[PDB]
Amino acid sequence: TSAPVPPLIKEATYIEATASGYMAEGVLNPTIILRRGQRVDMTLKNKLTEPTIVHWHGFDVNWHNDAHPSFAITPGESYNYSFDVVNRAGTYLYHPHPHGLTAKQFYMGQLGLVIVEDSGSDLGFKYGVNDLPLVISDRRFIGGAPVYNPTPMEMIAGFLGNAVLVNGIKDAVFKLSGGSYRLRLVNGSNARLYMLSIVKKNGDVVPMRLIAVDQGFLARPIEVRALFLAPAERAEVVVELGEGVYLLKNTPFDHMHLEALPEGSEYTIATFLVEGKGEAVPVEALPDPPPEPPKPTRTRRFALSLSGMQWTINGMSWNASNPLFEHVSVEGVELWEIVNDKASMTHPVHLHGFPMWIIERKDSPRQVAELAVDNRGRLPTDLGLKDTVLIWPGETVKIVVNFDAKKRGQLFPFHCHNLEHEDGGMMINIAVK
Amino acid sequence: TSAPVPPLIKEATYIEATASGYMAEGVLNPTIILRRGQRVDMTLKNKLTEPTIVHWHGFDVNWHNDAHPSFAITPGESYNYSFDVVNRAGTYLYHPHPHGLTAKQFYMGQLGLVIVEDSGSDLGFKYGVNDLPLVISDRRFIGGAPVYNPTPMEMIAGFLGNAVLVNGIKDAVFKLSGGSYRLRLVNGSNARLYMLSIVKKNGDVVPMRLIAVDQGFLARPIEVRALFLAPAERAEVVVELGEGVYLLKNTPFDHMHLQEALPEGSEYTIATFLVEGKGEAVPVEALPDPPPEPPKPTRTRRFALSLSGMQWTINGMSWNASNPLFEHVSVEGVELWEIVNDKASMTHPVHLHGFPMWIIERKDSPRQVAELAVDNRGRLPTDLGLKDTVLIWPGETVKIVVNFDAKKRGQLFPFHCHNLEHEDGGMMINIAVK
Ligand SMILES: [Cl-]
Ligand SMILES: [Cu+2]
Ligand SMILES: [Cu+2]
Ligand SMILES: [Cu+2]
Ligand SMILES: [Cu+2]
Ligand SMILES: [Cu+2]
Ligand SMILES: [Cu+2]
Ligand SMILES: [Cu+2]
């Protein structure tokens, strides 16, 4: 049996940012396991020929540990992180965040996973055996070599490759014994969107029980047939695989654009060869329910538009000359109406420093509304605590954010996680007052 | 006295393409000296994390040694160059040329000079003493670190830095003894255009005697007050510097555009010359090897440079990344090319691989350009020599003559703009010899 997953490291002391990815204590892009409540002390050394900085995607830390892109260190310098892990048990990321340089550093290998473990958060699964992170990325190979050469048009729409990888393996295969499997689905692409489905060889769709998203577990498992996974989103599902052949596929949908491997076309991401009797892992009781959203006291609207050549949020974009520019000043519990233009495309928007409760999807496309599970158009992934939510053209997504006074005087980026859009400047500072 | 110039190597055996530039036999981006007629045998090793290929800018070699961008080698692989040097004595370049990746590799340090020497081509000057290459580039520094982070719009117009370097030195100073100096002006920027003038501290413009351009010497020296130098253009001038302070400046002009930290047409100092004491005088008048007379064209071929929405195009075509061997234009024999730039455009340093070009005529030039011409066909002093990279202004027509020799038929040669943002965007086509 073979299950290719990233290697493990228990805590990280020393990470080198290299052109081929993160070299943490000698291993390349390992999954860092942290216990909730523990102290993290990690030192980043820049081994690149350009600035960089590590962002702990989805972590509840102050902006010095975020780290804000203005703290990017030059080639040869170092940056010391020191913070407490207060995030719920979930699957998080660590990736570069220097402005205008993030996409290529990310695309060329600087990406790793962080797993926060809480009391009984494993649910009886074991990493690399039946707890399998599946980081789905896409690269453009030219002469069998991954290349990142976006055109001006690709810098507006996003850089899409011609082949899809799982944990850096093209046409990945998993040889497993029959049993219960916890798959941590992670979109590690620059811009590519997936509609993930698991089907039998004959075509029967295998149901997936969604148990966790970006910021931890749901209240209870939710059965899904397919789920959209936008860049930097996380979705932990449990599947029951008996002896047979299973395909993790991208099911056909409408990529509302404006390609070698069309985004909304059907193709196989990974193949599962299941043979023999393995272990059954009972799953029903989830360890910690997500907290109830707080009552917002202010409504704030956000407009996502393409202003000529520059993606904008409320007509604003990143100010490269003054990275500390305070685009939006916030305070307390706010309700954000994020509204995407019809003359736009999909935006996986992401907010640093603070998790988000998803409240409502209105004017969603038919393919999305067909997957909702409540009277507010919320997808199964919306029913958990999130930090990266996908917004479709013409769609409005309402979220609730609690800007605590504990982080006042700090800046937190709010940007689209389409790395071409972010590098292009679709990023603003959220200043906590 | 101090004159910071690139180091020398006489011929190059082994060159490594690294993220910080070319490591050739242990030195970083050295000036390679070759004798005209000699055999070059050099091996390129890719030490990057992405494909690349070395282009011998302005060399008359077959497309395997050019090398055509389709021959880019992957990380770890090697490429052997082997050719005879048949180019006239001049100042040439070697820089990356993989499609879509050239601008950043170039910008981040992969650029060097090649000097071809013929009989008496030194004119009595000595490299690093009074024969000084001035490679003028510009970089955007953020926190004292050069970065290449173009926005979508910057990939349309070109990546302009906020500081100008001479041989990789910011606010470069040259401490020289008074005498004759041969300055080899080379534009090593990705997109920035310069109008170069040498002025005294009081403001007096020091005349420059142009002696050579891209493809070798002129018929005779030409005195100039200022000259435009577009990316990858070369202009060798001779100046007489007495004791005093001189400034190599960018003179104000209209950058016909459509970050503004350092406006392209604004005035600023590129290098400072502190001249003190008496050095050597070098008499210069008889220039070796006269440029050949242009051959008579038998076909006229028109080229339109336009911005088709988001894609810069040459005759409405752009580079086909899916088929790098795509034959955009098929040529044969001696052709006269009418390269016409749109009014709704910007400056294009146009460049053709494999074959030199005779400049024949400039019409509809802007006033600032027409004021510098030296003949009744609007030709600038730099047009009066054999070229391989010619600047074309919006609304201007430049007619050139190219002799598509029978020696290279069955081969492909790129024809692209040397604005590296424009080239990366796809402003490049294959010229197929029949
Ligand atoms: Cl609209
Ligand atoms: Cu992220
Ligand atoms: Cu976006
Ligand atoms: Cu971010
Ligand atoms: Cu060149
Ligand atoms: Cu060339
Ligand atoms: Cu151009
Ligand atoms: Cu070229």
Residue numbers in the entry:
A (entry chain A): 38 to 295, 303 to 477
B (entry chain B): 38 to 295, 302 to 477
Give verbatim excerpts from the published study on this entry.
Multicopper oxidases (MCOs) are proteins composed of three Greek key β-barrel cupredoxin domains (domains 1, 2, and 3) that come together to form three spectroscopically different Cu sites: type 1 (T1), type 2 (T2) and the binuclear type 3 (T3). MCOs couple the one-electron oxidation of substrates at the T1CU with the four-electron reduction of molecular oxygen to water at the T2/T3 trinuclear copper (TNC). In this study, we engineered the hyperthermophilic metallo-oxidase Pyrobaculum aerophilum McoP to enhance its activity for aromatics, resembling laccase activity, using directed evolution (DE).
The hit variant 1B5 of the fifth generation contained 12 mutations; to reduce to the smallest subset of mutations, the last round of evolution was performed with DNA-shuffling of genes coding for wild-type and 1B5. A library of variants (~ 4200 clones) was screened for ABTS activity, and variant 3F3, with only six mutations, was selected for further studies. The 3F3 variant selected after DNA shuffling showed a ~ tenfold higher kcat than the 1B5 and a remarkable 2-order of magnitude higher kcat/Km compared to wild-type. In McoP, a 23-residue loop 288TPFDHMHLEMGHGMQEALPEGSE310 and a short α-helix (188–195) are occluding the T1Cu. The overall average B-factor value of 3F3 (49 Å2) is higher than the wild-type enzyme (32 Å2), and the loop 288–310 in the 3F3 is the region that shows higher flexibility, with B-factor values ranging from 43–69 Å2 (vs. 22–58 Å2). Part of this loop (segment 296EMGHGMQ302) is not even visible in the electron density maps and was modeled with AlphaFold2 applying a local energy minimization using Yasara. The observed increase in flexibility of the loop in the 3F3 variant may be attributed to structural rearrangements resulting from mutations in the loop, such as P292H, as well as mutations close to the T1CU site, like P390T. The increased flexibility of the loop 288–310 in 3F3 caused structural alterations at the entrance of the tunnel: it is more polar than in the wild-type and has a larger diameter access entry (4.0 Å vs. 2.8 Å) due to the shorter distance between H294 and H292 (3 Å vs. 5 Å). In 3F3, W355, which is located at a distance of 3.4 Å from H465, exhibits significantly greater exposure to the solvent than in the wild-type.
